Design a protein around this ligand. Sequence first.
Ligand SMILES: N#Cc1cc(Cl)cc(Oc2cc(CCNC(=O)CCl)ccc2Cl)c1
Lengths: 548, 402
Amino acid sequence: ISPIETVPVKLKPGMDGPKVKQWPLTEEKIKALVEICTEMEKEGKISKIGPENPYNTPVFAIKKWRKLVDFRELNKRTQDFWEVQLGIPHPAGLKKKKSVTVLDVGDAYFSVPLDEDFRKYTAFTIPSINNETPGIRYQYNVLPQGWKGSPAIFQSSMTKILEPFAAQNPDIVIYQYMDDLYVGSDLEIGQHRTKIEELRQHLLRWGLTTPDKKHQKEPPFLWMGYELHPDKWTVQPIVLPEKDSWTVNDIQKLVGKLNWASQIYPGIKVRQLSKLLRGTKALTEVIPLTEEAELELAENREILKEPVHGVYYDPSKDLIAEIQKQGQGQWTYQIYQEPFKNLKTGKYARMRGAHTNDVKQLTEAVQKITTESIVIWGKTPKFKLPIQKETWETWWTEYWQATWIPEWEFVNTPPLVKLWYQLEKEPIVGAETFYVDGAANRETKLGKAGYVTNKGRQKVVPLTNTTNQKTELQAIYLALQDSGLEVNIVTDSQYALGIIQAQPDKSESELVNQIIEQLIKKEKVYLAWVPAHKGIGGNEQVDKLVSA
Amino acid sequence: IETVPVKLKPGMDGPKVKQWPLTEEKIKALVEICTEMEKEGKISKIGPENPYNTPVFAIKKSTKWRKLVDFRELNKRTQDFWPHPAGLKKKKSVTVLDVGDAYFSVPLDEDFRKYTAFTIPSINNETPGIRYQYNVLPQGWKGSPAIFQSSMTKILEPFKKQNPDIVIYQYMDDLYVGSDLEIGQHRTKIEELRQHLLRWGLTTPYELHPDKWTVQPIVLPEKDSWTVNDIQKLVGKLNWASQIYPGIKVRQLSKLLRGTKALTEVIPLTEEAELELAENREILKEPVHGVYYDPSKDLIAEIQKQGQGQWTYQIYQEPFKNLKTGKYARMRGAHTNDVKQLTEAVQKITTESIVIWGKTPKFKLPIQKETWETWWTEYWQATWIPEWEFVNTPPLVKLWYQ
Ligand SMILES: N#Cc1cc(Cl)cc(Oc2cc(CCNC(=O)CCl)ccc2Cl)c1
C-alpha cells in the first residue's frame, strides 16, 4: 500500500519469533499505551491482530509520555543486516560549502513500511488491569524503534527516496547520518532556501517530516563531539578530572579524552599514562600514578588551556604533513594545505616491541599518516620530515625489512632524526678482541658475566637474580666498559646478537639502555657470532671461565 | 543457460570481510568498471538484507584499470566442490594465458549469489558504499573454473588431439601450456591455441622455463687470505648446514683458531683444513634424500632481503625440509623499490609453486603489516592472491641463505 518498497527480512535459519511475556503494568501506564497506540493505529503505524498470533514482545511506558519496546529476543532471532556507518566522517575531510542546512527527520523509522511476512513477529500486548480481561494485541506495520534492521533498512529506503531529487539537483551535496540530513550548496542563500524547501516537499510526498521553523539547527553545529563553524571546525571542550586517587576506569576515560583532543590539539601525549593500564586487573583497582605520568597529564593540561581550530578541505590545494619528535618514543604530526591552517593533528608513540630506534619509529609514523590520509581524503600527502636522505637511505638499505619511503623533503627543525651509532661491518684491526660470555643457573637464578681477550685480560663479575639471557647482555656490556674506543666483541648468544644488530637507541631495559650509551661513546665496534660449544677460539675459554 | 547448484560447507556462513579503504583514483575506476558490468547483467545492486562482503581492489595488470576480488575467504568456505599434471615442471617452456572472461557466460546459482557481495568504499565514510553481487560466475572464485571445466575440455579437445605432447593445466583464471618445442615453434603453437579459443568465443587478451629451475646449492667462499673472523663465519655457516647435510665436519677448520686470537689476524689454511673445506664443498653439491611433498600439508614460503635487489626464498612444508629454494633479482629501473621487488618476488614464487604442485604457498613476508596492506596493489598483476602473514623477527640466517 505504501509507496516505499519493503526489504525482505527473514529470521535466522531454524529460529521462530519471540514469545516473551508481558509483565503487569501500572494502570496509569496502560492508559498511556492505549492512547499512544490508537494514535499510532490511526496513522497506520500499527494494527490490531487476531488471537492466532503466537508471538509477543514486552512493552512499557516512561517519561509527554513515550512507548518503549524490548525487541532483544526478536533481535537475537533476526538475520544479520549489512552494517551501517561504523565509521563517521571526519570534519577535516569535508569540503567548504557556501550554504549548509541541517534537517532532522521526525518519526523517521515509523515512516518506512515493514515486510508483511515479518510483521507477525513484532506483536506486542497492551496489558489489562489485573488480567481481568484479555489484553489488546498490536503488531507493527512500520520499522519498530529498537529493532535490529531498523537503522539499515531506513537508510536504504532514505537513499532510494533521495535518488529522484539528487538527479534534478546535481550541484547540491546531501549527506545522510542517522536520522539527520545535511544539505549544502554554493547557490545564493535565497536560491538555496528554495532548493531546501523543494526537498522538504519531495520528502513530505514520501512521508518524511522536516523542520518547519525555517531549519532548527544553526551554526555552530554540535555534532559527534565536534563544533562545525562556516570556516573552521574544532572539538568540543575537554574537561580532565582532578582526583587524589585514580582507578583503572578513571585512567581509561582520561586517555580517551586526551586521544580525542589529539586530532586538533598539537602536542598531546598519553604514553606514560597508558602504561599504568598494563596489568588491567579490574576497572576498580586503584593505580598509583607515576612521576612520569603526572608530568604528562600536567603538560596536557597546559596544552588544553588554549583553544585550537581546524580548517576544512579544498581539493585544489596540495596535502602536506609534517612530523616532529616529542621524545621518549612519542611523536606528533600536522596535516595542512596552507602553512599554518591545519586540517588535523595527531600523535604516535607505539614502541612495537621492547627495543626500537628513531628512524624505524619515524617510518611507522609516516605509515599511520598515510593510512589516515587515504581514509579521510582518499589521497596521500607530501611529507616534510626532520630527517636527511643520507640518514634514511642508509637505514632503509641496511634494514632487513622491506619499507616504502614516500617522496619527502628535509625540514631542518631540530630535534633532527639521526642514527646515534653504527656498528662496524668488518672487524677492526689493532683493537682488542673480547670474547664475552655469561651464565645463570635457572633454579638458583644467580650468575656471572666475564671476558677473555687477545691481550690476555680476563675478568668475571658476579650476578644475582638474573637469567641466561640477561647475563649474555651483561657480558657484552662488560666488554664495552673495560675496552678502549675501538673494540671487537665475540658472542655465542643469538639472543644478544639480535638485539644489538637491530641497532636500537631506546629500550624498556635499563641494561640495553646502558649498552646503547656505551655504543654511542665508542668510535668503532664490531660484533661477531660463533656457534656455542664447538671449540672455536676464545669462546671455549670464556665458557670454561664462567662455568667454574 | 542452466545453473549448477553451489553449496557452502555444512554449518558455514558466507564471508563478512572488511573492505579496505581506497584512494579516490581507485574508487573512480571501480565505479566506471562496475557501472558497465551492471549494464551487461554481470552484477546487480543489493539491499541491506545481504550482510556478506568480499573485498575488491583496483589494479592495472597496462593503461586500462582492472578489478580484482579477494575471494580468499569465500574460496575456503566454498572449498568442497569437485587435477594437476606432474609433467608441467618438466617442459622446457610454459606459457600462461588468461581465460577468465569466459566465466562471464555462465549464470551463477541464484541462491549462492548473495555470498559474492562486494562493496565499493566511500571516502571519509561520507556515503554508504555501493554494494553489488554477482549474477554470473566471478573471476577469482574457485567454483568458476570447476563449473566451466566441461566447457573448457570441449573447446580444448580438438587442440589436444592435434598436439598430444603439449601439456595444458588450468589453475583459476589461467591456462598453463607447456611444450618441449623450440621457442619460435612454442609461440606458434600458443598462437594457434589463442585463435582456437577466440574462434569459439573465449577472449584471451608470460613465458616460463621450468627446465632451468633447481634447488640452489649452499655456497662457501674462496679466499686468498683468510682471517679469524672468516674462519668463524665459515664455521658458523657449516654448523648450520650440519642440520641438513650430515657429513659436514669443522674439526680441522676450528683447530686453526685454537687459543685466544685477534679477529683481524690472518690464519693460514693448513692442508688438513683445506681438505675438510674442499670435502664440505662437495657434500653441498648433492641434495637431501628425505625431502618429499605431502599433498595434505600446506606449503610455506619464507623470503629474506639480501640487499642490492636480491631476495632469497625457501619453500617448505616442514622445517629444514626445503622442497625448493631460490634467489630473485630485478635490475633496477629508476622505479625499483623494496615493496615493488617483494611484490614481484611473491608472484614469481607463487607461479613457480603453481606449476610444480598446483597450489599456492603460505607466505611469511618480511614487511610491516600495514605497509603491505597499503601498497601491495600498486604492482600486483596476477589474477590470484596467496595467503600471507608478516615476519617481525629479523633473520640472522640472512647470510647463510645468500
Ligand atoms: N550537524 C551536522 C553536520 C555534520 C556533517 Cl559531517 C556535515 C554537515 O554539513 C556540511 C558540512 C560541510 C563542511 C563545511 N561546512 C561549512 O562550510 C558550514 Cl558549517 C560541507 C557540507 C555539509 Cl552538508 C553537517
